Design a protein around this ligand. Structure first.
Ligand SMILES: O=C(CC1CCCCC1)Nc1cccnc1
Length: 305
């Protein structure tokens, strides 16, 4: 038993991180087959970041302007092109360590693991949620750019995120691996507004089910509710509203614990109205929204890769 914020094992992704250098701007790139993907802002000088014309900047550049080191190795760039906000560098060598993988664009509330990197070397791994406002609350320094987010479904690495920027607010924005931003961010150093951030209600429900599994049962109560009365209370406290799809996703945890979804919402209701009153749930004094109902099930079933 027990309950931790687990990341996916990182091995399969470590063998794909390379160092990309253009002029004196060095950051991380992802090497799959014979292509290196990286943030297209690698071609900017710090002066260039206030108002980049990427088409104009990329034309001054040539294959041999780009240094791709894979540890002790240099790769040879023989084609270069821009897909939206990513640079695709065709290299002379397919990565022998290219796992089974796909590119996926994820939805708000989905969780993934980040391999944080500097000069193409892995630093650490953590789990996080894509916020409803399309930002992540990550841990990135300078040179972390090109660090990626990924899920593993047995043996297949799904890549969903590439790190491009910190906002003046200290939260983190980037792209899918086709180079389209999550949210309304642009890769320009200007004041940009994240939305209002909401709580991922379906994840909090998944996590109360995880508490009940692990013996922590104090918040369960006699009461109940409907979807509508629940959703009314949720909106007041900046919680995302709950649909029928969400109830369908919770059914296995409802079957495994013998607690109706609506009964769990009734318990959640009371906590938003009355709070914890000093108590904790799975050793936390706040309501946690960074576990999906899939994460909870995976961790309480012991699903491997
Ligand atoms: O925010 C950036 C990149 C932006 C990209 C757009 C132009 C300005 C620089 N760097 C970074 C990321 C994470 C932690 N520290 C620094």
């Amino acid at each position: 038993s027990g309950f931790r914020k687990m990341a996916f094992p990182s091995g399969k992704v470590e063998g794909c991180m390379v160092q990309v250098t253009c002029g004196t701007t060095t950051l991380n790139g992802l090497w799959l087959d014979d292509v290196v993907y990286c943030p297209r802002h690698v071609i900017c000088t710090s002066e260039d970041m206030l108002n980049p014309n990427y088409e104009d900047l990329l034309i001054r550049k040539s294959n041999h302007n780009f240094l791709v080191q894979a540890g002790n190795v240099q790769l040879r760039v023989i084609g270069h092109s821009m897909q939206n906000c990513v640079l695709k560098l065709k290299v002379d060598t397919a990565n022998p360590k290219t796992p089974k993988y796909k590119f996926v664009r994820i939805q708000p509330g989905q969780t993934f693991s980040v391999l944080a990197c500097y000069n193409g070397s892995p630093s650490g791994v953590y789990q996080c949620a894509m916020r409803p406002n399309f930002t992540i609350k990550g841990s990135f320094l300078n040179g972390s750019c090109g660090s990626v987010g990924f899920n593993i479904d047995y043996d297949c690495v799904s890549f969903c995120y590439m790190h491009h920027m910190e906002l003046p607010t200290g939260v983190h924005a980037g792209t899918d691996l086709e180079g389209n931003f999550y949210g309304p961010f642009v890769d320009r150093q200007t004041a940009q507004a994240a939305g209002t951030d909401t709580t991922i209600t379906v994840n909090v429900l998944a996590w109360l089910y995880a508490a009940v599994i692990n013996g922590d049962r104090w918040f369960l109560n006699r009461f109940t509710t409907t979807l509508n009365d629940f959703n009314l209370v949720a909106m007041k406290y900046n919680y995302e509203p709950l649909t029928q799809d969400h109830v369908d996703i919770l059914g296995p945890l409802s079957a495994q614990t013998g607690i109706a979804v609506l009964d769990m919402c009734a318990s959640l209701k009371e906590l938003l109205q009355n709070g914890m009153n000093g108590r904790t749930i799975l050793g936390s004094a706040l309501l946690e929204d960074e576990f999906t109902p899939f994460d909870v099930v995976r961790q309480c079933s012991g699903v491997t890769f």
